[PDB]
Scaffold this active site. Structure first.
Site, PDB file in Angstrom:
ATOM      1  N   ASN C  80     -14.530  49.270  -7.132  1.00  0.00           N
ATOM      2  CA  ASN C  80     -15.728  48.902  -6.382  1.00  0.00           C
ATOM      3  C   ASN C  80     -15.533  48.921  -4.866  1.00  0.00           C
ATOM      4  OD1 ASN C  80     -17.183  48.400  -8.832  1.00  0.00           O
ATOM      5  ND2 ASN C  80     -16.361  46.309  -8.911  1.00  0.00           N
ATOM      6  N   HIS C  81     -16.401  49.635  -4.159  1.00  0.00           N
ATOM      7  CA  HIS C  81     -16.366  49.616  -2.696  1.00  0.00           C
ATOM      8  C   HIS C  81     -17.322  48.561  -2.173  1.00  0.00           C
ATOM      9  CE1 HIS C  81     -14.747  53.963  -1.969  1.00  0.00           C
ATOM     10  NE2 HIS C  81     -14.282  53.465  -3.107  1.00  0.00           N
ATOM     11  N   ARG C  82     -17.110  48.131  -0.935  1.00  0.00           N
ATOM     12  CA  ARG C  82     -18.085  47.286  -0.256  1.00  0.00           C
ATOM     13  C   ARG C  82     -19.413  48.020  -0.061  1.00  0.00           C
ATOM     14  NH1 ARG C  82     -16.850  43.529   5.018  1.00  0.00           N
ATOM     15  NH2 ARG C  82     -18.762  42.263   4.858  1.00  0.00           N
TER      16      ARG C  82
END
Ligand SMILES: CC1=C\[C@@H](O)CC(=O)Cc2nc(co2)C(=O)N2CCC=C2C(=O)O[C@H](C(C)C)[C@H](C)/C=C/C(=O)NC\C=C\1
Ligand SMILES: [Cl-]
Ligand SMILES: [Cl-]
Ligand SMILES: [Cl-]
Ligand SMILES: [Cl-]
Ligand SMILES: [Cl-]
Ligand SMILES: [Cl-]
Ligand SMILES: [Cl-]
Ligand SMILES: [Cl-]
Ligand SMILES: [Cl-]
Ligand code: NA
EC number: 2.3.1.-
Lengths: 214, 209, 212
Positions: C80-82
């Site tokens: 998961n990326h920001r």
């Protein structure tokens, strides 16, 4: 001066998988912007992930800046489409006489360039079909098959592609698009990085208006 | 004119694309002439056929002039577990559990996988057990073929969805009647310009003749 | 009666099928006895667990008697990326950018992947972060499991589509209440014919509970 050198193929120390794409390009008709990366499964090059890409067709794969491209993403260019008027069978490839029936491009369901914008996040093992345009700040879910266009700042996925949701309100999206931070000077980008990263778009908008001089 | 269908590698300088039939080694795989497997790295077509067991006796059948893209996989009936209660295959582990071996009727077997003639199958398609694919159909890359596909239709997706028919019912009825793939190669070579351009009116003409 | 659940390769002549539990070396993974991974080429189950970082603290939990197909992948939360602003992971490249190292609270965490008991998972399934799969479920080959899966249901597709319940809601409630997978093996051995053929009515009797 903060930041990595976009000419460095392997900008992360100890990491042999994640590559800045631009300095690895060897083929023509692939134009990839700075800082865009490919996080390979096992060291393979970004170009190896580009399929059915022949100079004779002249189709282009175009990718912007600051894109995050996941492992196993593949780009299917236009050599994949068979003639569809009659039989799909490619007799000419086998020659021994059949080379006569070498098709002309006008008889092929050609699709044109694959065009991917800036700040685009593409998940693991996504497949991108020919002619597709993907907008700025999009997010493509893992294992998607991108079969149609993707709006800027939208999230999509599946096979075939379903729209999932807009990342922000239309007003905020409009502002990211008027900002275009990825086209700013690296000095300016660094200055604004805390806000590009935390999504303080109101702040980014004020700093932009401040610099307007217009 | 034309390549020798018994030539495993019919294109000069190409070690990936194979005529399938001269590569067949296993039982219960029946593939027609000129159908090819465009392999990724030279792997053989047979090894794309999975869970295929003689004791089940299901067959994979493929007609002529089919294009099978790289990574296409065929899942046969050995993949299905018993579904009355637990799906866990206790008998495989023996040590007393071998007596819980299911009879063939306990299993949800679904029959042969039958692909017709002149079918274009896309890269990395997966084909489920018991599937029937009609002549002239087109299966898009990455599709998971979970159900039967009509002659001369275009399909795709996971699960499979109908996209469109390639022609009108009439023209299809006519291609199906023509059955050009079953003509003699001298006649085919004669008629290739129209098989390729889809001039079905001309094809009916010359065939009446 | 039955194989040793600590035997990594419980089938003679088979070097692909592995009892998963005795192959686990990593923290934050727990897999029940008898659950197996039918590898493509001898690769281990842990090699199929991706983006799993201790600092994130997410767990992968799988119940007992599960059948896990070749190529099944488990995507945990390290992928998961920001998403607040740009998804570009600036901190990775450092050289000044390491000051933008995100906190765990900045990351869109999905929690644990939890898989129940007696679960059949088809070949080339992909399981997304934080998904829960109930007991007795069946996931079709090539499915991308994008959401939770009800017990004793059949699902498939990308994205995941519900297909059907396997049994009536009443019968499902009976299986869920019995939890045959947690019973002592002597009892399970006594009851295998009915666990396998699905005769829950008879199973209910064989138990002979305190509330007959
Ligand atoms: C898919 C599955 C388990 C997998 O997730 C793991 C494997 O694939 C490993 C494996 N499976 C095997 C040998 O290694 C194996 O030998 N199989 C599985 C395929 C048929 C028989 C077999 O017993 O044939 C017997 C006859 C002799 C009566 C019948 C057909 C058994 C059917 C059966 O129980 N299906 C349950 C499914 C098993
Ligand atoms: Cl892989
Ligand atoms: Cl674009
Ligand atoms: Cl708005
Ligand atoms: Cl591959
Ligand atoms: Cl024995
Ligand atoms: Cl770690
Ligand atoms: Cl450092
Ligand atoms: Cl959780
Ligand atoms: Cl139902
Ligand atoms: Na789908």
């Amino acid at each position: 001066d903060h930041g990595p050198d976009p000419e460095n193929i392997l900008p992360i120390k100890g990491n042999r998988n994640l590559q800045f794409i631009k300095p690895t390009i060897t083929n023509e008709n692939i134009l990839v912007g700075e800082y865009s990366y490919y996080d390979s499964k096992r060291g393979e090059s970004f170009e190896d992930q580009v399929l059915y890409h022949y100079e004779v067709i002249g189709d282009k794969l175009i990718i912007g800046r600051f894109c995050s491209i996941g492992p196993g993403t593949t780009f299917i260019m236009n050599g994949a489409n068979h003639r569809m008027d009659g039989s799909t069978y490619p007799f000419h490839l086998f020659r021994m006489g059949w080379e006569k029936y070498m098709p002309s491009l006008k008889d092929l369901p050609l699709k044109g360039d694959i065009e991917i914008g800036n700040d685009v996040w593409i998940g693991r093992d996504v497949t991108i079909m020919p002619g597709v345009k993907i907008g700025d700040g999009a997010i493509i879910a893992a294992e998607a098959v991108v079969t149609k266009n993707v709006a800027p700042y939208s999230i999509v996925g599946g096979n075939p592609l379903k729209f999932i949701r807009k990342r922000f309100s239309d007003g905020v999206i409009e502002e990211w698009l008027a900002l275009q931070w990825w086209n700013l000077d690296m000095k300016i980008i660094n200055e604004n990085l805390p806000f590009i990263i935390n999504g303080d778009i109101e702040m980014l908008k004020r700093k932009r208006k401040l610099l307007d001089d217009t």
